[PDB]
């Protein structure tokens, strides 16, 4: 029930650009690949263009295109992300790494010609020099999560929250609380959803021919309704 969902019926090329500063360490990431929103799939590869990434690749996954979530037919009315396209939306987050610092992010996600582009600014402060993040103590892997979405009539968008679980190499888990807002860029009408969630799955790998600091990301995301005996 949006002209925007028509742009996602096929496989769509993706470009990601991130400018970052964590505790003063400046870095940049470029990413490219493809998304298949009917399947709910991303296939992406990201490069640190400034040298060595000064934080663990997994801390950046959430920042580095929820318009690729598979929304089933019965739920097409609750798909804010696609409805804002092609003019797009602004995605902002604060991410609290428990017992450690935080990331603030601001991203514009929109079409440029036939490519879906996520451009991000990231500022991280108050990290411990030898915590799990600046100490590079996160395992190179990723968990499955539920991403909770509600409408925000006021801002003509959505609010979103979830908790990421990052495996630590000693067997513990580092939580990252995620608070999120999305606002359309265009003046066009958008879909404001009933409360629902996205169920996410991800795998991280390395390209054996890639000589730079990098991450290959495969992701599979499905939207779901709230059901009886949740909360």
């Amino acid at each position: 029930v949006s002209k925007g969902e028509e742009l996602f019926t096929g496989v769509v090329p993706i470009l990601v650009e991130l400018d970052g500063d964590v505790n003063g360490h400046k870095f940049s990431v470029s990413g490219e690949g493809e998304g298949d929103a009917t399947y709910g799939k991303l296939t992406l590869k990201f490069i640190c263009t400034t040298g060595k990434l000064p934080v663990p690749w997994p801390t950046l996954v959430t920042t580095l295109v929820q318009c690729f979530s598979r929304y089933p037919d019965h739920m097409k009315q609750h798909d804010f992300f696609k409805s804002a396209m092609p003019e797009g939306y602004v995605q902002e987050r604060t991410i609290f790494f428990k017992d450690d610092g935080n990331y603030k992010t601001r991203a514009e996600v929109k079409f440029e010609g036939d490519t879906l582009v996520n451009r991000i600014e990231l500022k991280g402060i108050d990290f411990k020099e030898d915590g799990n993040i600046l100490g590079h103590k996160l395992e190179y892997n990723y968990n499955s999560h539920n991403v909770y979405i509600m409408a925000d009539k006021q801002k003509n968008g959505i609010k979103v929250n979830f908790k990421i679980r990052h495996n630590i190499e000693d067997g513990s888990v580092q939580l990252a609380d995620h608070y999120q807002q999305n606002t359309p860029i265009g003046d066009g009408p958008v879909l404001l959803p009933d409360n629902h969630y996205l169920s996410t799955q991800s795998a991280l790998s390395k390209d054996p021919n890639e000589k730079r600091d990098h991450m290959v990301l495969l992701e599979f995301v499905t939207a779901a309704g709230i059901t009886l005996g949740m909360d």
Partner: protein, 123 residues
């Protein structure tokens, strides 16, 4: 896939029946996979392309191929309510008890999507 494998995955996802048929006649691997472990049959089932589903099965596609997320072609056909494709997959030995990583069968998906027609035949 390979060279032909990649063209076959792309042609199947794009719903190009003639292109799929020519690729298969020229020896493409019917079970080529992308990085997610998606096969041509997965992709055709997803988009509801009956012709490509039947052509691929006729060239020996694995009816019960699983992607890295545990989805089978039957799951993906059910995701989109493709009744005739479900019938064809079932008739070619699709596994009604295959579970994805959420523990769900194709029946469970039909139930989540409130689809009474699919629910009836996926039991």
């Amino acid at each position: 896939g390979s060279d032909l494998g990649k063209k076959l995955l792309e042609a199947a996802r794009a719903g190009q029946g003639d292109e799929v048929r020519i690729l298969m006649a020229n020896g493409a691997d019917v079970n080529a996979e992308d990085l997610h472990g998606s096969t041509p049959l997965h992709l055709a089932a997803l988009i509801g392309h009956l012709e490509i589903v039947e052509v691929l099965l006729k060239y020996g596609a694995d009816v019960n191929a699983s992607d890295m997320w545990g989805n089978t072609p039957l799951h993906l056909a059910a995701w989109s309510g493709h009744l005739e494709i479900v019938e064809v997959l079932l008739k070619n030995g699709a596994d009604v008890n295959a579970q994805d990583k959420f523990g769900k069968t194709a029946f469970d998906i039909s139930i989540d999507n409130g689809n009474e027609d699919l629910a009836e035949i996926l039991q």
